[PDB]
Design a binder for this molecule. Structure first.
Ligand SMILES: CC(C)Cc1nc(-c2ccc(C(=O)NCCC(F)(F)F)cc2)cs1
Ligand SMILES: CC(C)Cc1nc(-c2ccc(C(=O)NCCC(F)(F)F)cc2)cs1
Lengths: 191, 191
């Protein structure tokens, strides 16, 4: 309620500057409440970013769970594309939260642990699907599936987020999905 | 001389704690000089880390230039392995400088610009070799070479450095070279 207003204010302000330049007073004003009233909702501006990141991470996670439960009727290249696309659209639709949440991994144990927990979950699901593809005879038994899954997930983390931030260097945002799908499909199905 | 002693002290202290916990006084003592004498060599402890990172980055760069000028007589999988191995051995032999240098990208424009300049150089060289492989008919014309090169370089950055830091998640350090070579070779030569 007022919680949603604080979160919306923070996501808005993060589009024009870093969390280090946003004061508890800034978040209070945008939500139509006082500073002490802010502390009834959150202990710190750091907790507000942790909550925004938690919401975006869980949105991606539930979108991937939806795809897992509702297999698309398409070839294996388009199957992998739908999965990568969850992360491209979810994080790419919340660039300021993505940028600030990644930066906070350096200074917040809670943000680092959240990121680590979900990356472990997404890697495990990737490996399980590679294993299923090997079990059905579509993919060759090359690298250990979990190691391959880990490197492909870390590739997507660095490459998506560099593209969203317009880093130099980066893959243009309009090319990054096709780029990652190519590398996933060749490395999963290639002898 | 005393410069080399300051650099060695800093690389030593970075193995047990972050630069934020190392004082100009710490570096001065280990080099056998006073604090004001330290400032004759470097303006800041941040400049000392910038110099250590510059040395390691240039070591990798010159090792890659050496391989480029002295082609190994081996198959294309071993050719790509020798190149990735430059980064695995160079950065993997200087883990504390790697970890601290990557962390400083967030707060030092000079460190960010150094990292960006060399990543651009290594990506450009990767693309030129993929192009040569396509020109000779060994690799298929799939993705734009520069986009493929960028994603493979960013994969190696995130995956090598997570492995060196023992992040969760990470590829074990003893598996990371084979993991990356597989992904490079399948994505470069795969239809
Ligand atoms: C859904 C099925 C049909 C296809 C599948 N897709 C995935 C999948 C998992 C993780 C990521 C990813 O991009 N990780 C990195 C996330 C990031 F936020 F770090 F980028 C991409 C794809 C697993 S099984
Ligand atoms: C030498 C020939 C025979 C094979 C070749 N190898 C490369 C090559 C370039 C960059 C990286 C890399 O790992 N970048 C990322 C660097 C990092 F420090 F970020 F990890 C790996 C391989 C280019 S042509």
């Amino acid at each position: 309620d007022r919680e949603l207003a604080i979160l919306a204010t923070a996501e808005n302000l993060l589009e024009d500057r870093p969390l280090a330049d946003i004061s508890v007073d800034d978040l209070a004003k945008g939500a139509g409440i006082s500073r002490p009233t802010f502390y009834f909702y959150f202990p710190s501006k750091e907790a507000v970013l942790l909550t925004l990141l938690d919401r975006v991470v869980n949105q991606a996670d539930m979108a991937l769970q939806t795809l897992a439960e509702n297999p698309a009727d398409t070839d294996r290249e388009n199957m992998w594309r739908t999965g990568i696309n969850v992360f491209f659209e979810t994080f790419g639709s919340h660039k300021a939260v993505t940028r600030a949440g990644q930066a906070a991994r350096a200074t917040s144990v809670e943000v680092a642990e959240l990121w680590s927990t979900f990356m472990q979950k997404w890697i495990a699901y990737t490996a399980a699907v590679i294993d299923a593809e090997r079990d059905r005879g579509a993919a060759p038994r090359t690298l250990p599936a979990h190691e391959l899954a880990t490197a492909l997930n870390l590739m997507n983390e660095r490459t998506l987020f560099a593209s969203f931030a317009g880093e130099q260097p980066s893959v243009p945002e309009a090319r990054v999905l096709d780029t990652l799908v190519h590398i996933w499909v060749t490395s999963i199905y290639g002898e």
